[PDB]
């Protein structure tokens, strides 16, 4: 019954999806979906993610806090690289709050994101 | 549309009209002039925010209060409080540590009261 | 007043005045160009912020630091590491996921030996 | 109006105690009490700080979490010590859940604990 | 007093009787037998820990949690999940980073839901 | 199986073979003894635990680790620190806030020279 993350793999990139019930990521919700996508975070090197947040229109600090959690799992590949896309006009206002995002390449749709990760 | 501005048991009140729902960098231009006339009075000077009625705001806004809050603090006495928080907007400050000296209270009505002096 | 740059075991170091108690928007606008320029270096750069009598820093700060990062971060073998930094600096650092893009060190002797390896 | 912690000097330790409408320390309590908590964290080395949880009958994180910020103050200081005691039966269950406070001297009474500082 | 061990829809159900409002180390061991008999199913095994009425509990419950769970965890698609926390429990089991993996719900009905197989 | 002991830069470093990429109560229980027969070196006590390798961990290590820096912290000049702790791991040991007691590096070089300083 429970609404999960669809998880991906395009062109050697894991892309994390979010379904049209989570519109807004509260704690609730980040609960849901934490650990399909703390798993999706394994992979041979260069580990590459995209977080394709269209259609999500909230979120704040707990969902932040998952995103952490998965780039940290990621980060140490030399070439890996942890990125978003599809990021409403709302979102990056919440993003502006944070600065770890300045480490998250963003890109407007997931052809872009995908097209730069080659 | 601009915020209302009341003085209310020695206390600055910020209140907003229910078009204020979301709070994006264009509703933070309308409001500025406004918000910060407001941080001016006599010192000590103690100023509420009540946020009754906001549900979504990102870092134009919570740079508009802490500009405003960096007017205030100045006076070693002096209050800057946020009460009536939704609970998207907590998720929204959690994102930053700034706001953790501005204190929380549930309503104006039970703010009003502690903020007496 | 503006910030002390050194060069310490093949690290530049960044370190601060005691008037720079408090880093806010103002001394981060006295100390950018310097800090700045200060990221040029012969490769591969690193770099130490020693942070040793601040405070408090927020936001404009950080930003800053970031630029830094970014412009050292280029180079593959190089380092850009923390130390010293106060307890409520850790925080701010922490709460905004900050503190595990970079090293950060206790002490500057630790950093200096930690960064030769 | 609003209750907050008592603190008080005690024998060169800054002592934190709790008023009774503060039988359990939840996240609402927690952010009543977070400002005079961090603000008695400051001294002259070394820093001696006794957490007095008699009257105290719940906490759980959030409390734990506000004692480790105040701990982390003060933890640097060679003879610093960060100390707790009167901790009812239930709150030491809970504390055994954390490993933490395997570094915060424990004590039965906070005469037993103000003569273990001196 | 003992805990209550049901089979609902291929889901093993652990619920508790009023009386066990608090579980202290006394309550643990009352009820360890009959709980870790329950961990002991077909594979692969479903437990739903229904903790309605439980508000306290620390070390001693969460162990015995932990000790029925690493029974069931051989089993690749096991699963150990808990539903009805109350909040003074949700304020407990954060404490601890071991009960992640727990997937929680908010009822006994929901859980049931998701987790039919 | 055991835990491999060496002799680094004056550093007592303690490390895992392989088979140990999950650290339960049992892998624990077979350690325990070589691990605490390590603690007792020359003064002042230097102990690095290079967690390379390990991918799992939860209490009953940690117990076994804080009893170890039990004996080393006696030294006043002794240091006790984690290097190459797994992202999971680093959660684990923040979840109960045992991270910041002991200093943690990113690799084995990097902790030796450091514990040089
Ligand atoms: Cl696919
Ligand atoms: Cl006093």
């Given at each position: 019954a429970m609404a999960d993350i669809r998880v991906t793999?395009?062109?050697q990139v894991t892309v994390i999806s979010f379904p049209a019930?989570?519109?807004?990521?509260?704690?609730?919700?980040?609960?849901?979906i934490a650990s399909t996508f703390l798993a999706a975070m394994q992979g041979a090197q260069p580990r590459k993610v995209l977080?394709?947040?269209?259609?999500?229109?909230?979120?704040?600090?707990?969902?932040?806090?998952?995103?952490?959690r998965g780039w940290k799992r990621i980060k140490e590949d030399q070439?890996?690289?942890?990125?978003?896309?599809?990021?409403?006009?709302?979102?990056?206002?919440?993003?502006?709050?944070t600065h770890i995002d300045e480490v998250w390449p963003r890109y407007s749709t997931k052809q872009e994101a995908l097209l730069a990760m080659a």
């Amino acid at each position: 019954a429970m609404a999960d993350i669809r998880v991906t793999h395009e062109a050697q990139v894991t892309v994390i999806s979010f379904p049209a019930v989570f519109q807004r990521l509260r704690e609730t919700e980040v609960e849901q979906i934490a650990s399909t996508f703390l798993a999706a975070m394994q992979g041979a090197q260069p580990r590459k993610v995209l977080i394709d947040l269209e259609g999500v229109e909230f979120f704040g600090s707990s969902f932040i806090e998952l995103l952490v959690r998965g780039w940290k799992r990621i980060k140490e590949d030399q070439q890996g690289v942890f990125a978003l896309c599809s990021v409403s006009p709302y979102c990056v206002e919440v993003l502006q709050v944070t600065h770890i995002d300045e480490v998250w390449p963003r890109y407007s749709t997931k052809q872009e994101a995908l097209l730069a990760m080659a």
